[PDB]
Design a protein around this motif. Structure first.
Motif, PDB file in Angstrom:
ATOM      1  N   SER A   3      -6.526  -8.012   2.664  1.00  0.00           N
ATOM      2  CA  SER A   3      -6.739  -7.420   1.346  1.00  0.00           C
ATOM      3  C   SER A   3      -6.242  -5.980   1.238  1.00  0.00           C
ATOM      4  O   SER A   3      -5.942  -5.501   0.143  1.00  0.00           O
ATOM      5  N   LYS A   6      -1.519  -4.160  -0.210  1.00  0.00           N
ATOM      6  CA  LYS A   6      -1.506  -4.046  -1.663  1.00  0.00           C
ATOM      7  C   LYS A   6      -0.242  -4.592  -2.341  1.00  0.00           C
ATOM      8  O   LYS A   6      -0.212  -4.725  -3.567  1.00  0.00           O
ATOM      9  N   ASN A  35      -5.962   7.396  13.870  1.00  0.00           N
ATOM     10  CA  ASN A  35      -6.659   8.666  13.750  1.00  0.00           C
ATOM     11  C   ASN A  35      -5.670   9.799  13.466  1.00  0.00           C
ATOM     12  O   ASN A  35      -5.903  10.621  12.585  1.00  0.00           O
ATOM     13  N   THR A  38      -4.143   9.311   9.993  1.00  0.00           N
ATOM     14  CA  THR A  38      -5.059   9.743   8.946  1.00  0.00           C
ATOM     15  C   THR A  38      -5.126  11.274   8.833  1.00  0.00           C
ATOM     16  O   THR A  38      -5.050  11.818   7.735  1.00  0.00           O
ATOM     17  N   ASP A  56      -7.053  -6.121  12.478  1.00  0.00           N
ATOM     18  CA  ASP A  56      -8.302  -6.875  12.417  1.00  0.00           C
ATOM     19  C   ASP A  56      -9.305  -6.214  13.344  1.00  0.00           C
ATOM     20  O   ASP A  56      -9.109  -6.216  14.561  1.00  0.00           O
ATOM     21  N   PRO A  57     -10.405  -5.678  12.793  1.00  0.00           N
ATOM     22  CA  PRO A  57     -10.924  -5.723  11.412  1.00  0.00           C
ATOM     23  C   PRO A  57     -10.126  -4.867  10.426  1.00  0.00           C
ATOM     24  O   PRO A  57      -9.589  -3.829  10.802  1.00  0.00           O
ATOM     25  N   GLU A  58     -10.072  -5.290   9.171  1.00  0.00           N
ATOM     26  CA  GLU A  58      -9.333  -4.550   8.146  1.00  0.00           C
ATOM     27  C   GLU A  58      -9.822  -3.101   7.991  1.00  0.00           C
ATOM     28  O   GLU A  58      -9.040  -2.230   7.620  1.00  0.00           O
ATOM     29  N   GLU A  59     -11.108  -2.853   8.268  1.00  0.00           N
ATOM     30  CA  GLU A  59     -11.701  -1.521   8.099  1.00  0.00           C
ATOM     31  C   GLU A  59     -11.002  -0.426   8.935  1.00  0.00           C
ATOM     32  O   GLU A  59     -11.126   0.767   8.626  1.00  0.00           O
ATOM     33  N   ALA A  62      -7.998   0.210   6.283  1.00  0.00           N
ATOM     34  CA  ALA A  62      -8.103  -0.105   4.857  1.00  0.00           C
ATOM     35  C   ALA A  62      -8.300   1.136   3.987  1.00  0.00           C
ATOM     36  O   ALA A  62      -8.049   1.097   2.788  1.00  0.00           O
ATOM     37  N   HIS A  63      -8.747   2.230   4.595  1.00  0.00           N
ATOM     38  CA  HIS A  63      -8.873   3.494   3.883  1.00  0.00           C
ATOM     39  C   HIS A  63      -7.519   4.141   3.598  1.00  0.00           C
ATOM     40  O   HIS A  63      -7.421   4.998   2.725  1.00  0.00           O
ATOM     41  N   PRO A  66      -5.710   3.864  -0.146  1.00  0.00           N
ATOM     42  CA  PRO A  66      -6.309   4.745  -1.165  1.00  0.00           C
ATOM     43  C   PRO A  66      -6.131   6.230  -0.843  1.00  0.00           C
ATOM     44  O   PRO A  66      -5.968   7.063  -1.737  1.00  0.00           O
ATOM     45  N   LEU A  67      -6.184   6.561   0.438  1.00  0.00           N
ATOM     46  CA  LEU A  67      -6.101   7.945   0.864  1.00  0.00           C
ATOM     47  C   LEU A  67      -4.686   8.454   0.603  1.00  0.00           C
ATOM     48  O   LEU A  67      -4.499   9.581   0.162  1.00  0.00           O
TER      49      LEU A  67
END
Ligand SMILES: [Zn+2]
Lengths: 120, 317, 53
Positions: A3, A6, A35, A38, A56-59, A62-63, A66-67
RNA sequence: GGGCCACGGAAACCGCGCGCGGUGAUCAAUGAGCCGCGUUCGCUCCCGUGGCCCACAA
RNA sequence: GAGCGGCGGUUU
Protein backbone atom coordinates in the motif's frame (compact mmCIF):
# COMPACT_ATOMS: atom_id res chain seq x y z
CA UNK A 1 1.60 -4.84 -4.26
CA UNK A 2 2.19 -2.97 -0.94
CA UNK A 3 0.00 0.00 0.00
CA UNK A 4 2.92 2.38 0.47
CA UNK A 5 3.54 1.98 -3.28
CA UNK A 6 1.62 5.03 -4.46
CA UNK A 7 2.08 4.52 -8.22
CA UNK A 8 3.27 2.26 -11.07
CA UNK A 9 6.89 2.60 -12.17
CA UNK A 10 7.75 1.06 -15.60
CA UNK A 11 10.64 -1.44 -15.84
CA UNK A 12 12.66 1.10 -17.84
CA UNK A 13 12.33 3.86 -15.27
CA UNK A 14 13.08 1.53 -12.35
CA UNK A 15 16.29 0.41 -14.05
CA UNK A 16 17.32 4.05 -14.43
CA UNK A 17 16.80 4.64 -10.70
CA UNK A 18 19.31 1.90 -9.91
CA UNK A 19 21.70 3.42 -12.45
CA UNK A 20 21.44 6.85 -10.83
CA UNK A 21 22.18 5.37 -7.41
CA UNK A 22 25.10 3.39 -8.83
CA UNK A 23 26.59 6.43 -10.56
CA UNK A 24 25.84 8.85 -7.71
CA UNK A 25 27.64 6.49 -5.30
CA UNK A 26 31.19 6.56 -6.66
CA UNK A 27 30.99 9.95 -8.41
CA UNK A 28 28.79 11.77 -5.88
CA UNK A 29 27.11 11.31 -2.52
CA UNK A 30 24.36 8.93 -1.38
CA UNK A 31 22.97 7.66 1.93
CA UNK A 32 21.73 4.09 2.30
CA UNK A 33 19.34 2.49 4.77
CA UNK A 34 16.01 3.93 5.87
CA UNK A 35 17.32 5.76 8.92
CA UNK A 36 19.89 7.73 6.92
CA UNK A 37 17.46 8.12 4.03
CA UNK A 38 14.89 9.59 6.43
CA UNK A 39 17.41 11.93 8.12
CA UNK A 40 18.45 13.14 4.65
CA UNK A 41 14.88 14.04 3.72
CA UNK A 42 14.34 15.72 7.13
CA UNK A 43 17.53 17.79 6.95
CA UNK A 44 16.70 18.71 3.35
CA UNK A 45 19.71 17.08 1.71
CA UNK A 46 18.07 14.41 -0.45
CA UNK A 47 17.74 15.21 -4.16
CA UNK A 48 15.98 11.91 -4.83
CA UNK A 49 14.64 9.06 -2.70
CA UNK A 50 14.62 5.46 -3.93
CA UNK A 51 12.22 3.04 -2.23
CA UNK A 52 12.14 -0.77 -2.60
CA UNK A 53 8.75 -2.35 -3.41
CA UNK A 54 9.31 -5.56 -1.41
CA UNK A 55 9.66 -4.13 2.09
CA UNK A 56 7.99 -6.17 4.84
CA UNK A 57 6.66 -4.94 7.27
CA UNK A 58 5.45 -1.92 5.28
CA UNK A 59 5.87 0.29 8.39
CA UNK A 60 9.67 0.28 7.79
CA UNK A 61 9.32 2.68 4.81
CA UNK A 62 5.66 3.71 4.68
CA UNK A 63 6.35 7.09 6.28
CA UNK A 64 8.68 8.05 3.42
CA UNK A 65 6.25 8.95 0.67
CA UNK A 66 4.24 11.31 2.91
CA UNK A 67 7.43 12.74 4.39
CA UNK A 68 8.90 13.31 0.92
CA UNK A 69 5.83 15.15 -0.39
CA UNK A 70 5.91 17.30 2.73
CA UNK A 71 9.51 18.28 2.04
CA UNK A 72 8.61 18.26 -1.69
CA UNK A 73 11.34 15.75 -2.60
CA UNK A 74 10.97 13.35 -5.54
CA UNK A 75 10.70 9.67 -4.73
CA UNK A 76 10.66 6.62 -6.95
CA UNK A 77 10.26 2.85 -6.52
CA UNK A 78 12.46 -0.07 -7.56
CA UNK A 79 11.34 -3.73 -7.31
CA UNK A 80 14.04 -5.22 -5.07
CA UNK A 81 15.62 -4.16 -1.79
CA UNK A 82 18.46 -6.66 -2.38
CA UNK A 83 19.26 -5.11 -5.75
CA UNK A 84 18.93 -1.56 -4.40
CA UNK A 85 21.46 -2.54 -1.75
CA UNK A 86 23.97 -3.77 -4.34
CA UNK A 87 23.68 -0.51 -6.31
CA UNK A 88 24.21 1.46 -3.10
CA UNK A 89 27.51 -0.36 -2.77
CA UNK A 90 26.77 -2.80 0.04
CA UNK A 91 26.27 -6.57 0.11
CA UNK A 92 23.10 -6.39 2.22
CA UNK A 93 19.63 -5.18 1.16
CA UNK A 94 18.59 -1.53 1.35
CA UNK A 95 14.89 -0.74 1.87
CA UNK A 96 15.52 2.85 0.75
CA UNK A 97 18.25 5.15 -0.52
CA UNK A 98 18.73 8.90 -0.82
CA UNK A 99 20.89 10.57 -3.46
CA UNK A 100 22.49 13.61 -1.77
CA UNK A 101 24.68 14.76 -4.65
CA UNK A 102 23.97 13.24 -8.11
CA UNK A 103 27.42 13.69 -9.67
CA UNK A 104 27.56 12.09 -13.13
CA UNK A 105 23.84 11.43 -12.71
CA UNK A 106 22.58 15.04 -12.70
CA UNK A 107 20.74 14.47 -15.99
CA UNK A 108 19.44 11.02 -15.07
CA UNK A 109 18.14 12.34 -11.75
CA UNK A 110 16.58 15.32 -13.53
CA UNK A 111 14.85 12.97 -15.98
CA UNK A 112 13.48 10.63 -13.32
CA UNK A 113 12.01 13.51 -11.31
CA UNK A 114 10.07 14.52 -14.43
CA UNK A 115 8.45 11.16 -15.10
CA UNK A 116 7.41 10.66 -11.47
CA UNK A 117 5.94 14.15 -11.50
CA UNK A 118 3.68 12.80 -14.25
CA UNK A 119 2.83 9.61 -12.38
CA UNK A 120 1.82 11.44 -9.18
CA UNK B 1 -4.87 -27.80 18.68
CA UNK B 2 -7.28 -28.38 21.56
CA UNK B 3 -6.74 -26.90 25.04
CA UNK B 4 -8.98 -27.40 28.12
CA UNK B 5 -10.41 -23.89 27.65
CA UNK B 6 -11.86 -25.13 24.35
CA UNK B 7 -14.39 -27.40 26.07
CA UNK B 8 -17.96 -26.87 24.94
CA UNK B 9 -20.12 -26.24 28.00
CA UNK B 10 -23.85 -26.95 28.17
CA UNK B 11 -26.24 -24.31 29.54
CA UNK B 12 -28.70 -25.45 32.21
CA UNK B 13 -31.89 -23.43 32.65
CA UNK B 14 -32.79 -22.92 36.30
CA UNK B 15 -35.46 -20.22 35.98
CA UNK B 16 -37.44 -20.41 32.70
CA UNK B 17 -39.16 -17.06 33.32
CA UNK B 18 -36.16 -14.82 34.10
CA UNK B 19 -36.04 -11.64 32.02
CA UNK B 20 -33.77 -8.65 32.01
CA UNK B 21 -34.73 -4.97 32.03
CA UNK B 22 -33.14 -3.13 29.08
CA UNK B 23 -32.92 0.10 31.11
CA UNK B 24 -30.44 -1.28 33.62
CA UNK B 25 -26.76 -1.99 33.13
CA UNK B 26 -24.42 -1.45 30.20
CA UNK B 27 -23.90 -4.54 27.96
CA UNK B 28 -20.66 -4.11 25.96
CA UNK B 29 -22.20 -2.42 22.88
CA UNK B 30 -24.09 0.16 24.94
CA UNK B 31 -20.88 1.32 26.57
CA UNK B 32 -19.86 4.85 25.56
CA UNK B 33 -16.25 4.89 24.40
CA UNK B 34 -14.94 6.20 27.74
CA UNK B 35 -16.74 3.59 29.77
CA UNK B 36 -15.65 0.94 27.23
CA UNK B 37 -12.02 1.79 28.00
CA UNK B 38 -12.60 1.72 31.77
CA UNK B 39 -13.74 -1.87 31.46
CA UNK B 40 -11.51 -2.76 28.57
CA UNK B 41 -8.88 -5.31 27.61
CA UNK B 42 -6.44 -5.07 24.72
CA UNK B 43 -5.43 -8.19 22.79
CA UNK B 44 -1.93 -6.83 22.16
CA UNK B 45 0.54 -8.19 19.61
CA UNK B 46 3.78 -7.58 21.55
CA UNK B 47 6.79 -6.75 19.31
CA UNK B 48 10.18 -8.37 19.90
CA UNK B 49 12.61 -6.12 21.82
CA UNK B 50 10.96 -4.43 24.87
CA UNK B 51 9.94 -6.29 28.05
CA UNK B 52 6.25 -6.88 28.72
CA UNK B 53 6.26 -4.39 31.59
CA UNK B 54 7.77 -1.70 29.40
CA UNK B 55 5.15 -2.24 26.72
CA UNK B 56 2.38 -1.63 29.31
CA UNK B 57 4.14 1.47 30.61
CA UNK B 58 4.10 2.81 27.05
CA UNK B 59 0.39 2.04 26.67
CA UNK B 60 -0.50 3.90 29.89
CA UNK B 61 1.53 6.96 28.93
CA UNK B 62 0.28 7.14 25.35
CA UNK B 63 -3.39 6.39 26.08
CA UNK B 64 -3.36 8.52 29.27
CA UNK B 65 -4.49 5.63 31.44
CA UNK B 66 -4.06 5.55 35.20
CA UNK B 67 -3.77 1.77 35.42
CA UNK B 68 -3.22 -1.36 33.29
CA UNK B 69 -1.80 -4.84 33.70
CA UNK B 70 -0.79 -7.59 31.31
CA UNK B 71 -1.28 -11.36 31.57
CA UNK B 72 1.42 -13.99 31.18
CA UNK B 73 4.73 -12.15 30.91
CA UNK B 74 6.37 -12.56 27.51
CA UNK B 75 10.15 -12.37 27.34
CA UNK B 76 11.87 -9.45 25.56
CA UNK B 77 12.60 -11.31 22.30
CA UNK B 78 9.17 -13.00 22.10
CA UNK B 79 6.24 -11.65 20.03
CA UNK B 80 2.51 -12.26 20.11
CA UNK B 81 -0.54 -12.46 22.28
CA UNK B 82 -0.25 -10.27 25.36
CA UNK B 83 -3.60 -9.40 26.97
CA UNK B 84 -3.50 -5.93 28.54
CA UNK B 85 -6.36 -5.27 30.98
CA UNK B 86 -7.11 -1.55 31.52
CA UNK B 87 -8.27 0.61 34.42
CA UNK B 88 -11.17 -1.07 36.21
CA UNK B 89 -10.80 -4.30 34.22
CA UNK B 90 -7.16 -4.66 35.44
CA UNK B 91 -7.85 -7.33 38.04
CA UNK B 92 -9.36 -9.65 35.41
CA UNK B 93 -5.84 -10.77 34.42
CA UNK B 94 -6.13 -13.03 37.43
CA UNK B 95 -8.59 -15.11 35.35
CA UNK B 96 -6.10 -15.40 32.46
CA UNK B 97 -2.84 -16.20 34.24
CA UNK B 98 -3.87 -19.87 34.88
CA UNK B 99 -5.20 -20.42 31.33
CA UNK B 100 -3.48 -22.55 28.68
CA UNK B 101 -1.14 -21.01 26.09
CA UNK B 102 -0.09 -21.75 22.55
CA UNK B 103 3.18 -20.86 20.77
CA UNK B 104 4.82 -21.25 17.40
CA UNK B 105 8.52 -21.84 17.99
CA UNK B 106 11.65 -22.20 15.90
CA UNK B 107 14.16 -24.74 17.26
CA UNK B 108 17.77 -24.90 16.04
CA UNK B 109 19.42 -28.33 16.50
CA UNK B 110 23.17 -28.40 17.10
CA UNK B 111 23.71 -31.54 15.02
CA UNK B 112 22.15 -33.38 12.08
CA UNK B 113 19.08 -35.52 12.79
CA UNK B 114 16.71 -37.29 10.34
CA UNK B 115 13.28 -35.57 9.99
CA UNK B 116 11.47 -38.74 11.04
CA UNK B 117 13.39 -39.15 14.31
CA UNK B 118 12.97 -35.44 15.10
CA UNK B 119 9.23 -35.77 14.64
CA UNK B 120 8.98 -39.12 16.43
CA UNK B 121 11.03 -37.90 19.39
CA UNK B 122 9.14 -34.61 19.78
CA UNK B 123 5.81 -36.44 19.81
CA UNK B 124 7.01 -38.21 22.99
CA UNK B 125 6.86 -34.87 24.83
CA UNK B 126 3.06 -34.56 24.62
CA UNK B 127 1.56 -35.22 28.07
CA UNK B 128 3.28 -34.50 31.38
CA UNK B 129 6.80 -33.06 31.58
CA UNK B 130 9.02 -32.04 34.48
CA UNK B 131 11.16 -28.93 34.14
CA UNK B 132 13.45 -26.73 36.26
CA UNK B 133 11.23 -28.78 40.20
CA UNK B 134 7.66 -28.84 38.88
CA UNK B 135 5.31 -30.80 36.62
CA UNK B 136 3.64 -29.24 33.57
CA UNK B 137 1.31 -30.47 30.81
CA UNK B 138 2.05 -30.35 27.10
CA UNK B 139 -1.35 -30.66 25.44
CA UNK B 140 -0.01 -31.01 21.92
CA UNK B 141 2.99 -30.58 19.66
CA UNK B 142 2.81 -30.21 15.91
CA UNK B 143 5.84 -30.09 13.67
CA UNK B 144 5.06 -27.75 10.78
CA UNK B 145 8.33 -27.74 8.84
CA UNK B 146 11.92 -28.92 9.14
CA UNK B 147 14.78 -27.35 7.17
CA UNK B 148 18.00 -29.15 8.11
CA UNK B 149 18.67 -28.20 11.72
CA UNK B 150 15.72 -25.77 11.82
CA UNK B 151 12.52 -27.12 13.24
CA UNK B 152 9.33 -25.05 13.13
CA UNK B 153 6.60 -26.24 15.46
CA UNK B 154 3.41 -25.34 17.33
CA UNK B 155 2.85 -26.33 20.94
CA UNK B 156 -0.02 -25.95 23.39
CA UNK B 157 0.93 -25.95 27.05
CA UNK B 158 -0.21 -25.39 30.60
CA UNK B 159 0.39 -21.91 32.08
CA UNK B 160 3.93 -21.61 33.42
CA UNK B 161 5.55 -24.03 30.92
CA UNK B 162 8.86 -22.70 29.63
CA UNK B 163 9.20 -23.32 25.91
CA UNK B 164 12.97 -22.66 26.17
CA UNK B 165 13.40 -25.49 28.60
CA UNK B 166 11.15 -27.78 26.56
CA UNK B 167 13.34 -27.12 23.52
CA UNK B 168 16.47 -27.75 25.56
CA UNK B 169 15.07 -31.14 26.73
CA UNK B 170 14.18 -32.05 23.17
CA UNK B 171 17.80 -31.36 22.18
CA UNK B 172 19.00 -33.74 24.88
CA UNK B 173 16.53 -36.46 23.90
CA UNK B 174 17.99 -36.24 20.37
CA UNK B 175 21.54 -36.12 21.71
CA UNK B 176 22.80 -33.38 19.42
CA UNK B 177 21.27 -30.68 21.64
CA UNK B 178 19.20 -27.64 20.58
CA UNK B 179 18.29 -24.08 21.48
CA UNK B 180 15.25 -21.86 20.84
CA UNK B 181 16.00 -19.30 18.15
CA UNK B 182 12.53 -17.70 17.79
CA UNK B 183 9.25 -17.68 19.77
CA UNK B 184 5.78 -16.28 19.21
CA UNK B 185 2.73 -16.68 21.45
CA UNK B 186 -0.38 -17.30 19.34
CA UNK B 187 -2.87 -17.84 22.14
CA UNK B 188 -3.50 -17.15 25.80
CA UNK B 189 -6.79 -18.42 27.13
CA UNK B 190 -9.64 -16.73 25.23
CA UNK B 191 -7.16 -14.39 23.47
CA UNK B 192 -6.02 -15.67 20.06
CA UNK B 193 -4.67 -14.50 16.74
CA UNK B 194 -7.74 -12.94 15.19
CA UNK B 195 -8.95 -9.51 14.07
CA UNK B 196 -8.80 -8.26 17.67
CA UNK B 197 -5.05 -8.91 17.88
CA UNK B 198 -3.60 -5.45 17.45
CA UNK B 199 -0.08 -4.03 17.13
CA UNK B 200 1.23 -1.01 19.05
CA UNK B 201 1.26 1.07 15.87
CA UNK B 202 -2.40 0.40 15.15
CA UNK B 203 -3.30 0.88 18.81
CA UNK B 204 -1.72 4.28 19.09
CA UNK B 205 -2.77 5.40 15.60
CA UNK B 206 -6.38 4.40 16.26
CA UNK B 207 -6.19 6.22 19.57
CA UNK B 208 -5.19 9.48 17.84
CA UNK B 209 -7.79 8.91 15.11
CA UNK B 210 -10.20 9.05 18.04
CA UNK B 211 -8.77 11.86 20.19
CA UNK B 212 -7.47 14.11 17.39
CA UNK B 213 -9.62 13.30 14.34
CA UNK B 214 -12.89 12.55 16.17
CA UNK B 215 -13.18 9.02 14.73
CA UNK B 216 -14.17 6.60 17.47
CA UNK B 217 -14.71 3.47 15.34
CA UNK B 218 -11.15 2.18 15.05
CA UNK B 219 -10.13 2.71 18.64
CA UNK B 220 -13.37 1.19 19.87
CA UNK B 221 -12.52 -2.01 17.94
CA UNK B 222 -8.96 -1.98 19.34
CA UNK B 223 -10.44 -2.49 22.82
CA UNK B 224 -12.27 -5.63 23.92
CA UNK B 225 -14.92 -5.62 26.64
CA UNK B 226 -13.58 -7.17 29.83
CA UNK B 227 -16.17 -9.93 29.31
CA UNK B 228 -13.81 -11.34 26.69
CA UNK B 229 -11.23 -12.21 29.40
CA UNK B 230 -13.82 -14.47 30.97
CA UNK B 231 -15.01 -16.41 27.92
CA UNK B 232 -13.09 -19.53 28.93
CA UNK B 233 -14.64 -19.78 32.44
CA UNK B 234 -17.77 -21.60 33.61
CA UNK B 235 -20.57 -19.07 34.08
CA UNK B 236 -23.61 -18.60 36.21
CA UNK B 237 -26.07 -16.00 34.95
CA UNK B 238 -28.12 -14.14 37.56
CA UNK B 239 -31.46 -12.29 37.69
CA UNK B 240 -31.58 -8.49 37.68
CA UNK B 241 -32.89 -8.66 41.23
CA UNK B 242 -29.65 -10.21 42.60
CA UNK B 243 -27.14 -8.09 40.65
CA UNK B 244 -26.85 -5.00 42.87
CA UNK B 245 -26.59 -7.23 45.96
CA UNK B 246 -23.62 -9.09 44.45
CA UNK B 247 -21.92 -5.82 43.47
CA UNK B 248 -22.31 -4.80 47.16
CA UNK B 249 -20.46 -7.88 48.38
CA UNK B 250 -23.35 -10.29 48.86
CA UNK B 251 -22.56 -13.92 48.08
CA UNK B 252 -24.74 -15.38 45.34
CA UNK B 253 -27.55 -17.51 46.73
CA UNK B 254 -29.33 -20.22 44.74
CA UNK B 255 -32.61 -18.22 44.40
CA UNK B 256 -30.67 -15.65 42.34
CA UNK B 257 -29.68 -17.91 39.43
CA UNK B 258 -31.35 -17.84 36.00
CA UNK B 259 -29.13 -20.41 34.27
CA UNK B 260 -25.64 -21.81 34.56
CA UNK B 261 -23.04 -23.99 32.85
CA UNK B 262 -23.06 -27.72 33.51
CA UNK B 263 -19.99 -29.42 34.95
CA UNK B 264 -19.28 -26.92 37.73
CA UNK B 265 -17.48 -28.58 40.65
CA UNK B 266 -17.11 -27.21 44.18
CA UNK B 267 -14.13 -24.88 44.40
CA UNK B 268 -14.20 -23.91 40.70
CA UNK B 269 -13.51 -20.36 39.56
CA UNK B 270 -16.71 -19.08 37.96
CA UNK B 271 -17.81 -15.86 36.30
CA UNK B 272 -21.07 -14.38 37.54
CA UNK B 273 -22.81 -12.73 34.56
CA UNK B 274 -26.01 -10.74 34.09
CA UNK B 275 -28.65 -11.86 31.60
CA UNK B 276 -27.21 -9.22 29.25
CA UNK B 277 -23.83 -11.08 29.48
CA UNK B 278 -22.13 -8.36 31.52
CA UNK B 279 -19.40 -9.49 33.93
CA UNK B 280 -20.56 -8.83 37.48
CA UNK B 281 -17.98 -10.63 39.56
CA UNK B 282 -15.57 -13.55 39.86
CA UNK B 283 -16.16 -16.14 42.54
CA UNK B 284 -15.71 -19.68 43.76
CA UNK B 285 -18.48 -22.25 43.48
CA UNK B 286 -19.73 -23.59 46.82
CA UNK B 287 -21.94 -26.08 44.98
CA UNK B 288 -21.93 -28.27 41.89
CA UNK B 289 -24.07 -27.39 38.89
CA UNK B 290 -26.58 -30.07 39.84
CA UNK B 291 -26.75 -28.76 43.41
CA UNK B 292 -27.31 -25.17 42.25
CA UNK B 293 -29.84 -26.59 39.82
CA UNK B 294 -32.00 -28.67 42.15
CA UNK B 295 -31.73 -26.70 45.42
CA UNK B 296 -33.91 -23.73 46.39
CA UNK B 297 -31.77 -22.07 49.09
CA UNK B 298 -28.12 -21.75 50.19
CA UNK B 299 -25.00 -19.97 48.90
CA UNK B 300 -24.17 -21.08 45.35
CA UNK B 301 -21.10 -18.89 44.75
CA UNK B 302 -18.69 -17.18 47.16
CA UNK B 303 -18.21 -13.78 45.50
CA UNK B 304 -14.53 -12.75 45.53
CA UNK B 305 -13.82 -10.06 42.91
CA UNK B 306 -16.53 -7.56 41.91
CA UNK B 307 -16.07 -5.70 38.61
CA UNK B 308 -19.47 -4.15 37.86
CA UNK B 309 -20.08 -0.74 39.51
CA UNK B 310 -22.70 -0.62 42.28
CA UNK B 311 -24.90 1.87 40.42
CA UNK B 312 -25.49 -0.03 37.16
CA UNK B 313 -28.44 -1.96 38.63
CA UNK B 314 -30.84 -0.57 41.27
CA UNK B 315 -30.84 -1.93 44.83
CA UNK B 316 -33.90 -4.14 44.39
CA UNK B 317 -33.48 -5.62 47.87
CA UNK C 1 13.50 -13.24 11.79
CA UNK C 2 12.53 -16.40 9.99
CA UNK C 3 9.00 -17.34 11.11
CA UNK C 4 6.49 -16.29 8.47
CA UNK C 5 2.71 -16.57 8.19
CA UNK C 6 0.19 -16.75 5.35
CA UNK C 7 -2.13 -13.70 5.41
CA UNK C 8 -4.82 -15.98 3.83
CA UNK C 9 -4.12 -19.49 5.32
CA UNK C 10 -3.05 -18.32 8.81
CA UNK C 11 -0.44 -21.06 8.18
CA UNK C 12 2.97 -20.62 9.87
CA UNK C 13 5.83 -21.50 7.55
CA UNK C 14 9.46 -20.61 6.82
CA UNK C 15 8.66 -20.42 3.08
CA UNK C 16 7.85 -17.26 1.09
CA UNK C 17 4.85 -18.96 -0.54
CA UNK C 18 2.22 -20.68 1.59
CA UNK C 19 2.43 -24.51 1.27
CA UNK C 20 -1.36 -24.55 1.74
CA UNK C 21 -2.85 -21.25 0.33
CA UNK C 22 -0.12 -20.64 -2.28
CA UNK C 23 -0.23 -16.96 -1.20
CA UNK C 24 2.89 -14.84 -0.53
CA UNK C 25 3.75 -15.07 3.15
CA UNK C 26 4.70 -12.24 5.50
CA UNK C 27 7.06 -11.94 8.49
CA UNK C 28 5.18 -13.14 11.58
CA UNK C 29 6.48 -10.64 14.16
CA UNK C 30 4.99 -7.10 14.34
CA UNK C 31 7.25 -4.12 13.47
CA UNK C 32 9.36 -2.78 16.32
CA UNK C 33 7.79 0.22 18.08
CA UNK C 34 9.34 3.26 19.85
CA UNK C 35 7.73 5.27 22.64
CA UNK C 36 9.29 8.26 20.85
CA UNK C 37 7.62 7.20 17.55
CA UNK C 38 9.59 9.81 15.53
CA UNK C 39 7.65 9.31 12.27
CA UNK C 40 4.23 8.70 13.83
CA UNK C 41 2.84 11.84 12.19
CA UNK C 42 3.75 10.55 8.74
CA UNK C 43 2.73 6.95 9.26
CA UNK C 44 -0.73 8.26 10.34
CA UNK C 45 -0.88 10.32 7.16
CA UNK C 46 -0.31 7.14 5.07
CA UNK C 47 -2.73 5.14 7.22
CA UNK C 48 -5.64 7.62 7.05
CA UNK C 49 -5.35 7.49 3.26
CA UNK C 50 -5.32 3.66 3.29
CA UNK C 51 -8.44 3.65 5.52
CA UNK C 52 -10.22 6.54 3.74
CA UNK C 53 -10.44 8.64 6.89
C1' G D 1 -18.98 -8.74 63.71
C1' G D 2 -19.01 -10.22 58.09
C1' G D 3 -18.56 -9.17 52.66
C1' C D 4 -17.16 -6.01 48.92
C1' C D 5 -14.43 -1.41 47.11
C1' A D 6 -10.25 2.25 47.33
C1' C D 7 -5.36 3.70 49.08
C1' G D 8 -0.56 2.12 51.76
C1' G D 9 2.92 -1.92 53.04
C1' A D 10 10.28 1.67 50.66
C1' A D 11 13.55 5.05 48.19
C1' A D 12 18.14 6.30 45.28
C1' C D 13 22.02 4.82 42.10
C1' C D 14 24.68 0.82 38.82
C1' G D 15 24.53 -3.52 34.90
C1' C D 16 22.46 -6.51 30.93
C1' G D 17 18.79 -5.98 27.45
C1' C D 18 16.03 -2.73 24.90
C1' G D 19 14.59 2.43 22.94
C1' C D 20 15.93 7.36 21.16
C1' G D 21 19.75 10.94 19.35
C1' G D 22 24.57 10.98 16.81
C1' U D 23 28.14 8.48 13.61
C1' G D 24 26.74 4.76 9.51
C1' A D 25 29.80 -0.81 9.03
C1' U D 26 34.38 -5.61 4.61
C1' C D 27 27.02 -10.61 4.30
C1' A D 28 23.06 -7.33 11.27
C1' A D 29 21.47 -0.47 6.34
C1' U D 30 14.65 -4.04 8.71
C1' G D 31 21.31 -0.71 11.53
C1' A D 32 27.55 -3.19 13.31
C1' G D 33 30.87 -1.09 16.53
C1' C D 34 31.43 3.19 19.44
C1' C D 35 29.55 7.82 22.20
C1' G D 36 25.46 10.27 24.91
C1' C D 37 20.35 10.23 26.91
C1' G D 38 16.42 7.42 28.46
C1' U D 39 13.90 2.87 30.24
C1' U D 40 10.37 -2.44 33.60
C1' C D 41 3.46 -3.88 34.53
C1' G D 42 0.46 -5.98 37.66
C1' C D 43 -2.03 -10.00 40.44
C1' U D 44 -3.09 -13.13 44.83
C1' C D 45 -2.96 -13.82 50.14
C1' C D 46 -2.35 -11.32 54.84
C1' C D 47 -2.05 -6.72 57.76
C1' G D 48 -3.17 -0.93 58.50
C1' U D 49 -6.27 3.40 57.17
C1' G D 50 -10.77 4.89 54.84
C1' G D 51 -15.49 4.23 52.08
C1' C D 52 -20.08 1.30 50.69
C1' C D 53 -23.42 -2.64 51.95
C1' C D 54 -25.36 -6.65 55.09
C1' A D 55 -28.85 -7.79 50.00
C1' C D 56 -31.35 -16.47 49.99
C1' A D 57 -33.08 -12.05 44.94
C1' A D 58 -38.88 -10.48 46.50
C1' G E 1 4.80 -7.80 55.58
C1' A E 2 4.05 -13.90 52.41
C1' G E 3 3.99 -15.72 47.36
C1' C E 4 2.69 -16.30 41.63
C1' G E 5 3.25 -14.48 36.53
C1' G E 6 12.43 -10.89 33.26
C1' C E 7 15.19 -8.37 36.53
C1' G E 8 20.66 -8.77 38.16
C1' G E 9 23.32 -5.66 41.41
C1' U E 10 25.50 -2.04 45.36
C1' U E 11 23.66 1.31 49.28
C1' U E 12 19.90 3.81 54.62
ZN1 LIG F 1 -4.67 -20.97 3.02
Amino acid sequence: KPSYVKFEVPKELAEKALQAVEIARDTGKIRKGTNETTKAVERGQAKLVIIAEDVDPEEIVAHLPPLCEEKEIPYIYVPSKKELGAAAGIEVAAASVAIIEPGKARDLVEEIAMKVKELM
Amino acid sequence: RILPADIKREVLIKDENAETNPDWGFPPEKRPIEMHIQFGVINLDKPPGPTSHEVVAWIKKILNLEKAGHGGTLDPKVSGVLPVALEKATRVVQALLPAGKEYVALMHLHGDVPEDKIIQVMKEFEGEIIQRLRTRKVYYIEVLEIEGRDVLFRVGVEAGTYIRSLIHHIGLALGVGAHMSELRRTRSGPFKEDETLITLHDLVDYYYFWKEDGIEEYFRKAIQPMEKAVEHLPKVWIKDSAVAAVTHGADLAVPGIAKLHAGIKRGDLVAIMTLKDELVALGKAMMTSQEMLEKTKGIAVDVEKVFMPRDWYPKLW
Amino acid sequence: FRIRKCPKCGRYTLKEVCPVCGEKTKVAHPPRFSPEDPYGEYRRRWKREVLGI
